[PDB]
Scaffold this active site. Structure first.
Site, PDB file in Angstrom:
ATOM      1  N   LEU C  42     -54.577 -31.992 -25.926  1.00  0.00           N
ATOM      2  CA  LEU C  42     -53.914 -32.098 -27.299  1.00  0.00           C
ATOM      3  C   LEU C  42     -52.962 -32.892 -27.370  1.00  0.00           C
ATOM      4  O   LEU C  42     -52.297 -33.510 -26.492  1.00  0.00           O
ATOM      5  CB  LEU C  42     -53.212 -30.625 -27.618  1.00  0.00           C
ATOM      6  CG  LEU C  42     -54.488 -29.575 -27.783  1.00  0.00           C
ATOM      7  CD1 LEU C  42     -53.535 -28.313 -28.141  1.00  0.00           C
ATOM      8  CD2 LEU C  42     -55.440 -29.942 -28.763  1.00  0.00           C
ATOM      9  N   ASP C  43     -52.683 -33.366 -28.642  1.00  0.00           N
ATOM     10  CA  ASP C  43     -51.675 -34.256 -29.181  1.00  0.00           C
ATOM     11  C   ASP C  43     -50.349 -33.675 -29.378  1.00  0.00           C
ATOM     12  O   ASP C  43     -50.246 -32.600 -29.345  1.00  0.00           O
ATOM     13  CB  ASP C  43     -52.161 -34.920 -30.632  1.00  0.00           C
ATOM     14  CG  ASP C  43     -51.242 -36.171 -30.710  1.00  0.00           C
ATOM     15  OD1 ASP C  43     -50.382 -36.494 -29.939  1.00  0.00           O
ATOM     16  OD2 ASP C  43     -51.696 -36.849 -31.645  1.00  0.00           O
ATOM     17  N   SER C  44     -49.368 -34.596 -29.619  1.00  0.00           N
ATOM     18  CA  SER C  44     -47.982 -34.013 -29.807  1.00  0.00           C
ATOM     19  C   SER C  44     -47.918 -33.264 -31.231  1.00  0.00           C
ATOM     20  O   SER C  44     -47.458 -32.440 -31.572  1.00  0.00           O
ATOM     21  CB  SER C  44     -47.022 -35.138 -29.757  1.00  0.00           C
TER      22      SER C  44
END
Ligand SMILES: CCCCCCCCCCCCCCCCCC(=O)OC[C@H](COP(=O)([O-])OCC(O)COP(=O)([O-])OC[C@@H](COC(=O)CCCCCCCCCCCCCCCCC)OC(=O)CCCCCCCCCCCCCCCCC)OC(=O)CCCCCCCCCCCCCCCCC
Ligand SMILES: CCCCCCCC/C=C\CCCCCCCC(=O)OC[C@H](COP(=O)(O)OCCN)OC(=O)CCCCCCC/C=C\CCCCCCCC
Ligand SMILES: CCCCCCCC/C=C\CCCCCCCC(=O)O[C@H](COC(=O)CCCCCCC/C=C/CCCCCCCC)COP(=O)(O)OCCN
Ligand SMILES: CCCCCCCCCCCC(=O)SCCNC(=O)CCNC(=O)[C@H](O)C(C)(C)COP(=O)(O)O
Lengths: 219, 128, 88, 70, 63, 459, 84, 110, 104, 178, 175, 124
Positions: C42-44
């Site tokens: 997942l991304d930030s």
């Protein structure tokens, strides 16, 4: 001076109420606008009518605040109307009490608010007074209807917007009885009191038909 | 482009609108580091004095002592009579007195003139 | 008030319930200890969306400095329990 | 002093028949009162005494002479 | 039973004390309790005097 | 009048012959008995006065002040009991002796048929107060404070003595009865102007008048609690009593000589009140409040009308009781914290609820909440001033508002909010402190039931 | 006496985006090449007893039917009694 | 004689009994809110009688019962006006207060 | 003091101060119970202009309404006994100029 | 709140904070849930277009115009959680918070009630008394010369050790004591 | 009540209407007042009768103090302190009695306004005139003397008023 | 409303001022000039103590209505006939006021027309 101060107060406070998101703030600004209308009544030399409006406002505004407090307590101390959604069916007694109180506040015919607010509007329409104050009072009545609509629409009609853990509950005899007593009051007390008190001012028997209906039209 | 925000004395500039924070230089980083260093040293000192089971009193704050002393007792030794101080003292300490004296003297002169002329209608004025 | 005394099991169940409704996560893959950036990819911004969804679920908000370093469901549950003083 | 109602977690809350019946009864009472009062007192909303038209009054009763006497 | 004791100690005793105080001490002085004069309409009769107020001038009644 | 004077003198051998651990008990009990005796002075006539002898007389202006003076001594002993625990027996006896001596001088001063006897005793009250301030004060500024409190007073009152003897050379008497019955108008002359100034400024400096008030914050902050109580409650009222007594010979000059002072008060009551809004000390705030109240009393005395005098008497009594209570509450905080700073010890209502109730009642009384006698005096002075000039209300109204602000400020900073975390030596309040607060506050609320007893001879 | 009855959460597979305005949101987003990752999280707000709404006019006329029936009955009784 | 004054003063006087009992034992128990609510309801029912007597006849009274003080030619006394406004606003305020107190027993339970 | 960080772990959370840090000369002016300088969504000058404009416009319009009143097409109200001479003040020993009301 | 602050915020942290703030104010503007989802997806699409920018200067030039746009359209009355620093119940229960040392001043008759609680309290007191002497030396040895650079504290490293300066974090009153 | 003089505090005959019920419904006011009588007025009457007989068992008296007239300030020598003292005390007693006369007239005015109700502006006219006369006399006697008032100051005020009146009358006659 | 528009946007002198109305003698129109009648006397009106602003030409109906409301107390809606009579009399009073306003307006119109005709004749 009293008439002008009342008119500016009622207009300004209704205008502020037209766009507030806290439910308590909306009801407080409605209270302030009603007080401005009471001062407008004093200014046009109608003190007994102002006292009658005091008596009716007591009933229906107190019921409105109780309904708001019921919603706030049931939604875990949440007061913003952005986060209360469909409560029309989830809690029906508060819904019906709030609807009746909003109808009385807007001068729905033959309710507690009728016997004071309708006479206030009729009296201010047929007096030697400021035109600006009269216009401000009419716009204030329209804005009263408008912010009552805002409260109902954003608190009862849409889809739910509160957190998933539903703790909604009205089934407490204390809350129900306390609300229902002032509900019966805000339905019948205007009729009873108006029919019981002696006449204290000359009536407005004959008025133009458009001028008699102006309060209903603006509402 | 959007209309600009103009800061004032009682509505300051948001920190997120400061051009100073977007001009980052190594000296600014070192300044921030040593600011945090002195803050952490003070916090460590306070927390050491605070969690002590033996301590049973008030932790004296030299900053508070300095604030109160500078506000109360350090004023006069650093006072110097200058045109600004002299003019401000004269105004703020003399002007109100003479203004109010003129107001009350004029009002009472008018009232006494009316009483002497007999045209004041002081009926029912028993208690004075 | 009349609010039930929520427990750590309830907090964990609700956190996993919210995470399983996030279609970016495969419900089979994730666990209580599953890291967000590595185990789940997942991304930030996905993490900040997850934190906001947790805040909406539990009715209280996490400060950004504390939120930015919550990388597992287990430490999210632990943070909520510590904040709400739930020992059990 | 109420009854036990448990939370639901994303489902419509449990409702008592008593509160539904009470709310519907009070709403019906309000509407019946309004209709009854309008039936019996309709002049409180529409008025009872017609507003005359001043321009329709003849010059005789207004003391108006044909522009030559005075 | 609790309601009976409440009505006795919280309504009856204060009303007794106040009625005694008003009837025997407050009214012992003049003008302490001043009462609005009752309204007299045509056709009424007075208990003290017994005289009858004459009726009105027979206004021409219609509608 | 000797029925009160002789027991007050016998308090001294009673104190010095007492056991080492029974001085406080004996002094408190017999002081309370003397106060009970003094209560009988309150039975006054609408006629002249109670002329006991050629030396002493009493009036309904003197009677409330005498009762307050006799009542204050047990409270001062109770509050002083705490901080003098580690003192030697001889020095404790010396402290009690100073308090007794001060009381004896005060009682005689308030009766004082003659004006030069009044001057002698009204000056004699200076020595015990100076010793109390400069011997049992905590800080190093006490010495400086004492100097101010001394010299200001003397600078104001050495001319008065001259005026007094000059008057006796022309009138032939300084007896107040003869002075009143043989009064003559003062012609508008430079000599008469300076005689007016000499007669007035001695009592002006002790009120204190705004501009001459610099000694008061120093003396009240640096003095021990008993000294602060006696200064705020009784010693400020000597100037008011003296001005009330001596204005009978200064007419009609007072019609226009009062203008400089009235303004100095009417504007001054604003400034000092505003000063209370920015004050980091509790004692300094209470002292500046005292200055504002006495400024309003000054306006009352200068207006010189019956309602003015009644309001001034009521306000003197009310302020004495209220200021003593507020000083006692501040000292209760100080003995726990040892700092005397408002911002440091906070949120005290959670930790001490009953003391928070005492603080609330004291703040409400200082705020002049009706029907407290504080409001009775303030309202009588305000009505008299409105009769004097309809514009004064503006200033008066402003003061009222400002007063409330700083009063509630003091109540909110210290009692509300969150407690200071690092302060962990706040013990529960002792029975002595609670009893002191109750004995301060109950007489006020009882006096509101019979206000005619504190409304002066013009009632 | 408090609410300790061990409430159990429903099954997460129950909530579907179909039949809700979230579906229309998804169509409008896919028209631009976008998608809603949290769409199923809010479907419960349109699923159960919350699926049906009431208009403002319908809200104001909450009990007009029973009230009107009672009014008709009462006015009929008044007519049958006064005309006697 | 003339129950108007007695009833009007009785309402106001019995509104104060719980304040006198706030130092008694009931103030330390959980029956105090119910005690105050019951007192307010009883006071409302009591005050409903002078309203009826005014409605029937138009009774209006002034009761100057306690003389506080007299500043020369000005007399200040404890005086109550029991005109139309007073006897109409007392029942409304007491009714609303009774409802609000019963609501608060539920709202402020914790 | 209101615009300090509310999420920091201050030693005095209510005052938002740290032990030992220098204290602003005017701390008691900014204590979150008093004047605050927090940035606002709308600029100070715009806010002042709008508020002053609203108040001035209302005052001017009230003055205009005073100049141009509103009333009904009716004559004065008529009262029988010399405009109620005896019941309004009285003076029954002066025999005023009697006023008569015109029936139409 | 619990975490120790750093000397500065990096660009990534500022971008994330702007994203969260803008999302919250957009939610406040768009009351209804489906509309909020639509415009939140639009905001995310507008946000990640410049995700892959490499230079620092033009990346910093963005997030500046972005903050100006946020300030212009920031919904002057945003939604606030009731317990948040602007919520309607922010410090509602802080008047019910009483320190633990107050229990040291209870009368023996009051401590006669709750004997088990006060016995546990004495056990905690003894544990604190020993652990403090251990903790002082631990922190003295561990800290760098010239004082601590940052206000972050170390954990316990031995078997019987307790984390330094633990008493006033463990013994918080409660979130809702009454 | 004989406790006060009816001439000093006059009251009207107080005519009241007689009950003329126009409907067959029983009004609740009569039942409530009969209940009030039975439950309140009878115990109160019994207690008062008991207390009154207890008082009658032990009867004693108190008297109103009479004061002789003494020479006033107008016949005192310049420095004759004893006569000035007596005159000053007499003047103070007269001032108090005058205050109380003004108080009595004010009470008369206030009682009448309430009793008259709506027609107080016409009905209370006699009461209003008496207050005006008494207020004018009192204001002439005692206004502007100050806090340190005395018989000498009142005498000086009256002397200057008489001088003004004499000068005005002389200038009017010689006009 | 229309009279406000006519006065404030048209010619002010064309229409009456309500503060100084009436500006013309009562006998200018016709010399009949029948007087209004009062049924309630001074003393009975004072005894009923209606109000200073209620003591108008309709006061007999108000006295009858007050006698009604007092006599049949529990039935607070017993006589609605008397309320109707009082309202009808007040309606007639208001219509008389309206007629007075209209008469003054027409008289002002004819006076202005007379002035214009005289000016035109003098110009010719
Ligand atoms: C209304 C009349 C009812 C009469 C009933 C009898 C009342 C007796 C009161 C005795 C005086 C109390 C003095 C204060 C300390 C008392 C000791 C104490 O700590 O008690 C704790 C005790 C036990 O509680 P706890 O658990 O230990 O307390 C824990 C904490 O301390 C927590 O404590 P707390 O939070 O409960 O705080 C104590 C409480 C109460 O504490 C107080 O504030 C007491 C003082 C209040 C006034 C402050 C001074 C302002 C000037 C007022 C002057 C009034 C003089 C009246 C004559 C006095 C004669 C003695 O605080 C308040 O209630 C706020 C007061 C705000 C009052 C606002 C209006 C005031 C003036 C209204 C007009 C009154 C006259 C009307 C005349 C015209 C019509 C007749 O509780 C009480 O006793 C409460 C006392 C009741 C307060 C009543 C306030 C109104 C009455 C004022 C005085 C008498 C009026 C006479 C006319 C009556 C009619
Ligand atoms: C004359 C008035 C002079 C002004 C007095 C100044 C007082 C100074 C000291 C006050 C203490 C400071 C203080 O209380 O802080 C201000 C405090 C905090 O602000 P909040 O909005 O509540 O913020 C909280 C949310 N974060 O708010 C206040 O109380 C400010 C009140 C100041 C009012 C001043 C303006 C009043 C002017 C009135 C003009 C109208 C005249 C009357 C018209 C009627 C015509 C008959
Ligand atoms: C806190 C500081 C206050 C200090 C005191 C301020 C007040 C000063 C009062 C003036 C001082 C002189 C006292 C005089 C005593 C009264 C006696 C008197 O008035 O008799 C006069 C005497 O009057 C004088 O002699 C006055 C001369 C003044 C000399 C001293 C000057 C001191 C400073 C004066 C200016 C300051 C006053 C105000 C101070 C403001 C604040 C500091 C008449 O004398 P005869 O010759 O017998 O009669 C004339 C017909 N043949
Ligand atoms: C209603 C209020 C109005 C709102 C207006 C707001 C306007 C916002 C639009 C501005 C566009 C921008 O972002 S300005 C573009 C700023 N510059 C960059 O994005 C370059 C590198 N980006 C990063 O590093 C980030 O952190 C990232 C990789 C995204 C995250 O990384 P992670 O997660 O791996 O940690």
């Amino acid at each position: 001076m009293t008439l002008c101060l009342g008119a500016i107060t009622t207009l300004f406070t209704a205008l502020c109420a037209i766009t507030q998101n806290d439910i308590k703030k909306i009801v407080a600004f409605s209270t302030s606008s009603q007080l401005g209308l009471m001062m407008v009544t004093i200014g046009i030399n109608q003190p007994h009518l102002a006292f009658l409006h005091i008596c009716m406002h007591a009933f229906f505004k107190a019921m409105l605040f109780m309904c708001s407090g019921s919603i706030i307590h049931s939604l875990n101390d949440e007061q913003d109307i952005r986060k209360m959604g469909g409560l029309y069916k989830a809690m029906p007694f508060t819904t019906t009490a709030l609807i009746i109180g909003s109808l009385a506040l807007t001068g729905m015919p033959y309710l507690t608010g009728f016997y004071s607010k309708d006479l206030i509007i009729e009296a201010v329409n047929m007096s030697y007074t400021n035109a600006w104050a009269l216009l401000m009072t009419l716009i204030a009545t329209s804005l009263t209807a408008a912010y009552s609509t805002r409260i109902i629409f954003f608190a009862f009609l849409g889809k739910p917007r509160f957190p998933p853990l539903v703790l909604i509950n009205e089934n407490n005899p204390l809350l129900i009885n306390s609300i229902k007593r002032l509900l019966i009051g805000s339905i019948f007390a205007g009729f009873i009191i108006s029919n019981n008190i002696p006449p204290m001012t000359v009536p407005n028997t004959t008025m133009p038909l458009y001028m008699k209906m102006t309060a209903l039209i603006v509402t | 482009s959007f209309p600009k925000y103009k800061p004032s004395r009682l509505a300051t500039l948001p920190a997120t609108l400061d051009p100073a924070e977007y001009d980052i230089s190594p000296e600014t980083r070192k300044a921030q580091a040593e600011r945090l260093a002195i803050r952490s040293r003070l916090k460590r000192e306070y927390l050491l004095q605070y969690n002590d089971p033996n301590r049973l009193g008030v932790i004296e704050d030299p900053a508070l002592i300095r604030w109160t002393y500078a506000r109360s007792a350090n004023i006069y030794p650093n006072f110097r009579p200058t045109p600004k101080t002299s003019l401000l003292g004269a105004l703020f300490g003399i002007g109100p007195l003479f203004f109010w004296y003129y107001v009350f003297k004029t009002d009472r002169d008018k009232k006494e003139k009316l009483i002497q002329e007999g045209k004041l209608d002081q009926t029912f004025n028993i208690s004075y | 008030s009349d609010a039930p005394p929520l427990t750590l099991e309830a907090i964990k169940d609700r956190v996993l319930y919210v995470l399983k409704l996030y279609d970016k996560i495969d419900p089979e893959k994730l666990s209580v200890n599953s890291h967000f950036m590595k185990d789940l990819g997942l991304d930030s911004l996905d993490q900040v969306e997850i934190i906001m969804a947790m805040e909406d679920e539990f009715g209280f908000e996490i400060p950004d400095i504390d939120a930015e370093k919550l990388m597992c469901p287990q430490e999210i549950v632990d943070y909520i329990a510590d904040k709400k003083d739930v020992y059990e | 002093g109420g009854v036990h109602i448990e939370p639901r977690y994303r489902q419509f809350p449990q409702l008592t028949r008593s509160q539904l019946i009470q709310a519907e009864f009070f709403s019906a009472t309000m509407w019946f009162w309004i209709l009854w009062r309008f039936w019996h007192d309709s002049d409180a909303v529409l008025g009872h005494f017609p507003y005359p038209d001043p321009s329709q009054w003849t010059d005789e009763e207004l003391g108006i002479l044909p522009d030559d006497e005075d | 039973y609790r309601h009976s004791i409440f009505a006795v100690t919280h309504v009856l005793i204060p009303v007794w004390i106040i009625h005694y105080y008003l009837k025997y001490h407050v009214t012992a002085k003049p003008y302490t309790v001043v009462e609005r004069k009752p309204r007299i309409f045509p056709g009424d009769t007075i208990l003290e005097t017994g005289e009858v107020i004459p009726l009105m001038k027979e206004f021409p009644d219609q509608h | 009048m000797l029925k009160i004077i002789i027991p007050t003198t016998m308090l001294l051998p009673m104190t010095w012959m007492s056991k080492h651990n029974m001085i406080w008990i004996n002094a408190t009990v017999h002081s309370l008995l003397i106060s009970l005796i003094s209560l009988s002075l309150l039975n006054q006539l609408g006629e002249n006065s109670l002329n006991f002898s050629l030396t002493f007389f009493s009036d309904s202006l003197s009677a409330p002040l005498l009762v307050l003076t006799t009542w204050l001594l047990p409270l001062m002993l109770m509050a002083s009991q705490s901080h003098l625990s580690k003192e030697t027996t001889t020095r404790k006896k010396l402290y009690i002796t100073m308090l007794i001596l001060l009381q004896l001088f005060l009682i005689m001063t308030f009766t004082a048929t003659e004006l030069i006897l009044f001057y002698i005793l009204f000056e004699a009250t200076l020595v015990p107060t100076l010793i109390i301030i400069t011997r049992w004060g905590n800080q190093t500024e006490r010495l400086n404070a004492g100097l101010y409190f001394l010299f200001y007073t003397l600078a104001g009152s050495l001319p008065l003595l001259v005026a007094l003897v000059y008057i006796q050379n022309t009138t032939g008497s300084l007896n107040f009865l003869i002075i009143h019955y043989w009064s003559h108008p003062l012609s508008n002359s430079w000599s008469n102007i300076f005689m007016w100034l000499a007669c007035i400024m001695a009592f002006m400096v002790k009120m204190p008048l705004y501009g001459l008030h610099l000694w008061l914050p120093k003396a009240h902050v640096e003095a021990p609690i008993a000294g602060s109580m006696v200064l705020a409650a009784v010693l400020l009222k000597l100037g008011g009593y003296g001005m009330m007594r001596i204005t009978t010979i200064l007419n009609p000059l007072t019609n226009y000589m009062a203008y400089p002072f009235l303004m100095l008060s009417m504007w001054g009551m604003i400034m000092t009140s505003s000063i209370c809004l920015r004050q980091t000390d509790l004692k300094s705030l209470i002292a500046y409040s005292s200055v504002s109240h006495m400024a309003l009393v000054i306006v009352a005395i200068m207006i010189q009308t019956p309602w003015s005098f009644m309001g001034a008497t009521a306000l003197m009594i009310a302020h004495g009781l209220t200021s003593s209570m507020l000083f006692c509450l501040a000292n209760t905080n100080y003995e726990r914290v040892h700092s005397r700073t408002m911002i440091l010890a906070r949120g005290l209502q959670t930790l001490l609820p009953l003391m928070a109730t005492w603080w609330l009642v004291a703040s409400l009384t200082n705020l002049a909440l009706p029907p407290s006698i504080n409001l009775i005096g303030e309202l009588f002075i305000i009505t008299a001033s409105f009769s004097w000039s309809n514009i004064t209300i503006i200033l008066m109204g402003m003061n009222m508002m400002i007063t409330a602000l700083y009063s509630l400020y003091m109540l909110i900073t210290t009692q509300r909010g969150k407690y200071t975390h690092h302060i962990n030596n706040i013990k529960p309040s002792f029975t002595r402190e609670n009893a002191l607060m109750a004995l301060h506050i109950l007489p006020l609320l009882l006096l509101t039931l019979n206000p005619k007893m504190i409304l002066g001879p013009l009632y | 006496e408090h609410g300790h009855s061990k409430m159990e959460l429903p099954d997460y597979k129950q909530w579907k985006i179909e039949g809700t305005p979230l579906e229309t949101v998804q169509e409008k987003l896919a028209a631009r090449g976008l998608r809603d990752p949290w769409g199923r999280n809010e479907a419960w707000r349109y699923s159960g007893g919350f699926a049906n709404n009431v208009s403002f006019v319908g809200a104001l006329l909450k009990g007009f039917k029973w009230g009107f029936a009672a009014f008709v009955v009462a006015v009929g009784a008044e007519y049958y009694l006064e005309s006697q | 004689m003339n129950p108007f004054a007695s009833l009007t003063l009785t309402t106001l006087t019995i509104l104060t009994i719980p304040i006198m009992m706030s130092n008694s034992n009931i103030y330390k128990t959980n029956l105090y809110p119910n005690y105050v609510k019951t007192t307010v309801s009883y006071a409302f029912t009591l005050s409903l009688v002078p309203l009826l007597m005014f409605m029937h006849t138009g009774q209006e009274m002034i009761i100057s019962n306690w003389h506080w003080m007299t500043l020369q030619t000005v007399e200040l006394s404890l005086s109550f006006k029991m005109d139309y406004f007073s006897v109409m606003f007392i029942p409304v305020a007491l009714f609303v207060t009774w409802s609000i107190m019963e609501f608060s027993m539920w709202y402020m339970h914790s | 003091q209101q615009e300090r960080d509310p999420w920091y772990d201050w030693d005095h959370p209510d005052l938002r101060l740290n032990w030992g840090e220098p204290i602003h000369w005017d701390l008691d002016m900014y204590i979150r119970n008093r004047v605050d300088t927090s940035p606002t969504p709308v600029s100070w000058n715009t806010m002042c202009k709008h508020l002053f404009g609203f108040v001035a416009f209302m005052l001017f319009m009230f003055w205009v309404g005073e100049i141009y009143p509103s009333y009904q097409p009716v004559g004065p109200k008529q009262y029988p006994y010399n405009d109620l001479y005896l019941e309004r003040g009285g003076d029954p020993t002066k025999e005023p100029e009697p006023v008569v009301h015109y029936e139409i | 709140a619990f975490s120790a602050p750093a000397a500065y915020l990096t660009h990534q942290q500022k971008v994330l904070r702007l994203y969260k703030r803008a999302l919250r104010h957009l939610e406040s503007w768009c009351v209804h849930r489906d509309k909020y989802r639509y415009f939140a997806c639009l905001m995310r699409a507008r946000f990640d277009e410049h995700k892959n920018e490499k230079d620092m200067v033009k990346a910093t030039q963005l997030l500046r115009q972005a903050e100006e746009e946020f300030w212009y359209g920031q919904h002057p009355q945003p939604y606030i959680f009731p317990e948040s620093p602007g919520g309607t119940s922010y410090e509602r229960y802080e008047c019910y918070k009483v320190p633990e040392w107050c229990l040291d001043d209870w009368h023996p008759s009051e401590k006669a009630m709750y004997p088990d609680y006060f016995a546990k309290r004495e056990q905690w007191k003894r544990l604190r008394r020993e652990s403090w002497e251990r903790e002082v030396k631990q922190l003295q040895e561990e800290t760098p010369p010239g004082g601590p650079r940052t206000e972050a504290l170390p954990p316990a490293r031995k078997e019987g050790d307790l984390p330094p300066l633990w008493w006033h974090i463990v013994t918080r009153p409660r979130e809702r004591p009454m | 009540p004989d406790s006060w003089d009816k001439d000093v505090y006059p009251e009207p005959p107080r005519r009241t209407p007689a009950p003329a019920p126009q409907t067959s419904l029983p009004n609740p006011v009569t039942y409530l007042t009969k209940i009030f009588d039975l439950l309140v007025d009878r115990p109160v009457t019994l207690a008062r009768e008991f207390i009154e007989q207890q008082h009658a068992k032990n009867r004693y008296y108190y008297y109103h103090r009479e004061f002789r007239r003494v020479p006033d300030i107008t016949e005192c020598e310049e420095k004759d302190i004893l006569c000035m003292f007596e005159a000053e005390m007499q003047w103070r007693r007269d001032y108090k009695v005058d205050q109380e006369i003004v108080n009595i007239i004010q009470e008369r005015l206030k009682a009448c306004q309430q009793r008259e109700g709506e027609s107080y502006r016409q009905n209370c006219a006699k009461e209003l005139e008496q207050f005006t006369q008494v207020s004018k006399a009192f204001q002439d006697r005692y206004s502007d003397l100050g806090a340190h008032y005395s018989a000498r100051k009142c005498l000086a005020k009256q002397k200057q008023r008489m001088l003004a009146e004499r000068k005005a009358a002389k200038e009017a006659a010689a006009a | 409303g229309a009279h406000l528009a006519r006065r404030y946007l048209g010619d002010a002198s064309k229409e009456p001022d309500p503060l100084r109305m009436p500006t013309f003698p009562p006998d200018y129109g016709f010399p009949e000039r029948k007087e209004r009648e009062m049924v309630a006397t001074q003393q009975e009106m004072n005894d009923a103590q209606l109000m200073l602003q209620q003591r108008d030409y309709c006061a007999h109906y108000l006295i009858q209505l007050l006698k009604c409301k007092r006599d049949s107390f529990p039935n607070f809606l017993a006589c609605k006939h008397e309320q109707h009579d009082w309202d009808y009399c007040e309606h007639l009073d208001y219509v008389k006021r309206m007629k007075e306003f209209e008469r003054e307006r027409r008289l002002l119109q004819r006076k202005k027309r007379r002035e214009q005709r005289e000016a035109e004749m003098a110009r010719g």
